[PDB]
Structure formats: C-alpha cells, structure tokens
Amino acid sequence: EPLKVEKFATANRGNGLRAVTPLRPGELLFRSDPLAYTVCKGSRGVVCDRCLLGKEKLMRCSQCRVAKYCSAKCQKKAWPDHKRECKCLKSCKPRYPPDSVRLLGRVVFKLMDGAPSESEKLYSFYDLESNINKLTEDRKEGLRQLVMTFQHFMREEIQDASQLPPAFDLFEAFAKVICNSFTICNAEMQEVGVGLYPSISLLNHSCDPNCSIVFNGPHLLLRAVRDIEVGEELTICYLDMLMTSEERRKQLRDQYCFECDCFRCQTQDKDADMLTGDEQVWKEVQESLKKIEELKAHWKWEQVLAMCQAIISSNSERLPDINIYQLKVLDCAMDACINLGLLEEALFYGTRTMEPYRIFFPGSHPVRGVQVMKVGKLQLHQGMFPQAMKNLRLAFDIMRVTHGREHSLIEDLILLLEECDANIRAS
C-alpha cells in the first residue's frame, strides 16, 4: 500500500500510531529490523549474537571472545555492527556490561557510522519518549549509575561528546532505553534479546490490545489482532499477560511512568481467578519462581524441572492450575521437559496449561498460539492424531492472525498439519 499506520499526537499519552485504513485481524501493519539489538545476559553464548537462533556449537569472536555466532556467515555479517564494541568488550574483560549499556553502545555506533536506519522511518531514537519529568529520584540515581557504566565500558571508543551524536545526552538516552526497549523472544517464546525499534515505539500500551508483535530472529512483525477502524489508535500489551492489575500498576509506574485507567485495571479483571488457592502456598511459589525463571533464562533445564516438580507434585498443599504462579511453574516444567526429551511428561504439563491459557490470552495472542502448537506437536509425535489435529488447527487459527505467512514458524506448523492429516487420511 501506502502505509496502513500513521504517527499522531494523542490527547493524553503522547505520540501514538493510528490506522489509516480499516484493518482486519491478521493484517500485517508494519515490520522492522532493529536500530540496535543484543543478546540478553542469560542467552549469551547459548544463541547466535546475530540471528538469535540456538545451537550446541557456537564459535566465538577471536578478538573479544564475548560475541558468539552460529556460522561463519553470521560472524562475518555481524562484524560491521560488532567492530567498535569488540575493542570495548575485550578492554573491559572480565566485566560484562548490563544489557541496556551494550544496547546503547550499539545505538551510538549505528547513529555515528551507519546510514540512516530504516527502523527510524516513522519515529527516530532522537524522538523517543524519555519521561524525564516523571522520573523518581530513585530512578534518576539508577540512570546516573548506567551513564557511569556506559562511560567506563565505552572508554576505548568514546572519550567525549565529539564521538556521540550532536547534543546527545547519555542520561536522556538511558531514560529512552528504559521505556522503549523491546524484549525479543525466539520462536519458542523464550526471551533471547533486547532491541530498539523506534518506529514501533510509537505504539501505546493496552491491557486488552488491538495489535500484537512477534519476532522472527531480530525481525519484528506488527499485526492487527482485532478489527480496527480508520483513525483508531493501535495498541499492544507491553506486559506479560499473567499479571494482576496491582503487578501491572507497579511495572507501568516504575518502567513506563503512567497510570492505567482501562476497564481491566478499573475492575481488577481476572485478578481473583489468577490468585485462587491458598495465599501462603502461592506466595512461596511466587518466591521460588524468581529462581526458576533465572535458571530458565540461563537455559538450565534439569534444574528448572527439579524445582518445578517439587511444586507441581508437592507432598504439601497444591495450587489450582488457573493460579498464575502455578501456571508459570507448569509452563517452565513443560519447556524443560521438551528441551530434555521427556515428551510424555511435557505433554502432561502442557495439556494442564491449555484451559488457563484460553482464559488468560483472550482472542488471538501469539503466546497462546505457540503453546497450543507445542501441545499439538507433542500429541502428534505420541500418535494421538485426533487430539493433535484439533490443537494444530486451533494453533493455526491463532497463528495465522498473530504470526502470519511472513513468519517462518507458520511454515513449520503447516508441515505438522500436513503430517497429521496424512495420518487421519490413512486411518
């Protein structure tokens, strides 16, 4: 087309994006590569720095030995955007910067040395919201420490303002990174990276959004997940869906500097179901999930499983599977079992998540699509063809909207549907 989306000034949430034309569910609205991105702390040396895909053997950069790649192609193609950070990562070994500092280093090299980035077509890094006039004194102290970390990390390549863009202010730049960073998940919906996508950063938040984002490696696809009218604002949910209105309030304040008065937040929509079961038990499970989630972020599946089994099959009191902390534990146990080849056990945990996921991911949401695909795949390979086909079709109905033909995972699902339908054809 011309574009289906445009920048505008909203009445009370800054700049946003609105529909130029009526939009239908599954319609591709925009796509972008990042201005800058990096692998997250826990996936470092587990996934390729460039394509964010995993592999038993990664090859490191010989100069810094921090960057690791899946292939010669990826190591070579990454070199231009790695060249300057390489000198810094080496210089500062064995100190590894926070992900926000590595990210901002890549922003500064891209803006100093690169051609104008296609990622900034609708909105640039310069234009991003910083919320500087709402930052608490505590936040400002933490930004000051990031600035001093960046100055330390980058000293080999950046000694003064001459090597930053004109009137670039590192404090403001970090403030922009906090409230504009995208979390990059792999095809299995595991966090692997963080990136800046300035055009896409126009999207304001809704706890019941009309669009979704998905990632195919570092590439971001924005799709409609509802009917949208001409002039209607486009929204995504910035947060994990498995959060109460109080948890959403805390993160939207702390990270985004705004108060949400949507219907869901006004009515604590779903919070009572999410916290069913005995509070003493779900409080302990919430506490244990800090460690389980840290182990998962480091791809430590045997330790994830052990901790999850101690909860799911506890000798002591148990939670209903609609309890969000129980549900996260089931999720982590399912993924651990898939990665360990414990496929009967995986399917047990995955099937228990299906009804909670139907409730907590209403309409078309990519996380529920992928979860249903995983369960259907487990059923297909265990010879449960009618159960598998039902789940793979449901996954397709969701993923055709959330992922679309432009996402390679849809090709993988199409192959599973074909295999399943050959089996029912022969039956």
Ligand X SMILES: C[S@@+](CC[C@H](N)C(=O)[O-])C[C@H]1O[C@@H](n2cnc3c(N)ncnc32)[C@H](O)[C@@H]1O
Q: Contact residues for Zn ion (CB under 5 A)?
A: 48, 50-51, 61, 63-64, 67, 70, 74, 86, 207, 260, 262, 264-265
For residue 185, the cross-strand partners are 191
Name which of 17 and 51 has its Cβ closer to Zn ion. 51
The CB-of-123 to ligand X minimum distance in angstroms stands at 7
In the structure encoding, which two tokens stand for residue 301, read together?
A: 């599946």
- What does the alpha-carbon distance between residue 108 and residue 96 come to, in Å, rounded to a whole number? 18
- What does the alpha-carbon distance between residue 317 and residue 413 come to, in Å, rounded to a whole number? 38
The CB-of-421 to ligand UZK minimum distance in angstroms stands at 29
- What does the alpha-carbon distance between residue 311 and residue 180 come to, in Å, rounded to a whole number? 35
Q: Are 47 and 41 contacting, i.e. CB atoms less than 8 angstroms apart?
A: no
Q: Among residues 251, 311, 250, which one has the least CA distance to residue 281?
A: 311
For the CA atoms of the chain, what is the radius of gyration? 22
User: Does 387 sit near ligand X (CB under 6 A)?
Assistant: no
Residue 146 partner contact from Zn ion, ligand X, ligand UZK, none using kind-dependent CB cut-offs of 5 to 8 Å: none
Give the up-direction half-sphere exposure of residue 321: CA atoms within 13 A in the CB hemisphere: 17
Cβ count within 10 A of residue 376: 26
User: Does 362 sit near ligand X (CB under 6 A)?
Assistant: no
Distance of CA 231 to the CA centre of its chain: 27
Residue 74 partner contact from ligand UZK, Zn ion, ligand X, none using kind-dependent CB cut-offs of 5 to 8 Å: Zn ion
In this chain, which stretch among 53-61, 107-115, 183-191, 264-272 interacts with ligand UZK, using CB under 6 A?
183-191
Q: Where are the alpha helices (DSSP H) in 353-402?
A: 354-360, 366-381, 385-402
Sequence-distant (6+) residues with CB within 8 A of 264 are: 207, 208, 245, 270
Using CA atoms, how far residue 217 sits from 73, 85, 122, 193, 214, in Å, is 15, 21, 22, 9, 10
User: Does 182 sit near ligand UZK (CB under 6 A)?
Assistant: yes
**Mode of pairing for the β-strands spanning 219-224 and 28-32:** antiparallel
The CB-of-258 to ligand X minimum distance in angstroms stands at 4
User: Does 201 sit near ligand X (CB under 6 A)?
Assistant: yes
User: Does 367 sit near ligand UZK (CB under 6 A)?
Assistant: yes
Residue 265 partner contact from Zn ion, ligand X, ligand UZK, none using kind-dependent CB cut-offs of 5 to 8 Å: Zn ion
- What does the alpha-carbon distance between residue 59 and residue 66 come to, in Å, rounded to a whole number? 10
User: Does 201 sit near ligand UZK (CB under 6 A)?
Assistant: yes
User: Does 179 sit near ligand X (CB under 6 A)?
Assistant: yes
Residue 382 partner contact from Zn ion, ligand UZK, ligand X, none using kind-dependent CB cut-offs of 5 to 8 Å: none
The closest residue (CB) to ligand X is: 14
User: Does 124 sit near ligand X (CB under 6 A)?
Assistant: no
Residue 63 partner contact from Zn ion, ligand UZK, ligand X, none using kind-dependent CB cut-offs of 5 to 8 Å: Zn ion
In the sheet that 219-224 helps form, which strands lie side by side, from edge to edge?
28-32, 219-224, 211-216
User: Does 245 sit near ligand X (CB under 6 A)?
Assistant: no
In the structure encoding, which two tokens stand for residue 329, read together?
A: 């534990």
In this chain, which stretch among 6-14, 178-186, 274-282, 296-304 interacts with ligand UZK, using CB under 6 A?
178-186
- What does the alpha-carbon distance between residue 243 and residue 268 come to, in Å, rounded to a whole number? 11
- What does the alpha-carbon distance between residue 209 and residue 234 come to, in Å, rounded to a whole number? 8
User: Does 215 sit near ligand UZK (CB under 6 A)?
Assistant: yes
Tell me which residue has tokens 């209903």: 320
User: Does 366 sit near ligand UZK (CB under 6 A)?
Assistant: yes
**Mode of pairing for the β-strands spanning 182-185 and 68-69:** unpaired
Name which of 201 and 245 has its Cβ closer to ligand UZK. 201
Using CA atoms, how far residue 326 sits from 1, 268, 283, in Å, is 45, 20, 11
Name which of 257 and 333 has its Cβ closer to ligand X. 257
Name which of 111 and 242 has its Cβ closer to ligand UZK. 242
- Applying CB under 6 A, which of residues 256, 325, 360, 361 lies at the interface with ligand X? 256
Which residue ranges make up the site for ligand X (CB under 6 A)? 13-16, 128-129, 131, 179-180, 201-202, 204-205, 256-258, 260
Per the annotation, binding residues for Zn(2+) are: 48, 51, 61, 64, 70, 74, 82, 86
Which residue ranges make up the site for ligand UZK (CB under 6 A)? 180, 182-183, 185, 189, 191, 201, 213, 215, 238, 240, 366-367
Per the annotation, binding residues for S-adenosyl-L-methionine are: 13-15, 123, 131, 180, 204-205, 238, 258
Per the annotation, binding residues are: 13-15, 48, 51, 61, 64, 70, 74, 82, 86, 123, 131, 180, 204-205, 238, 258
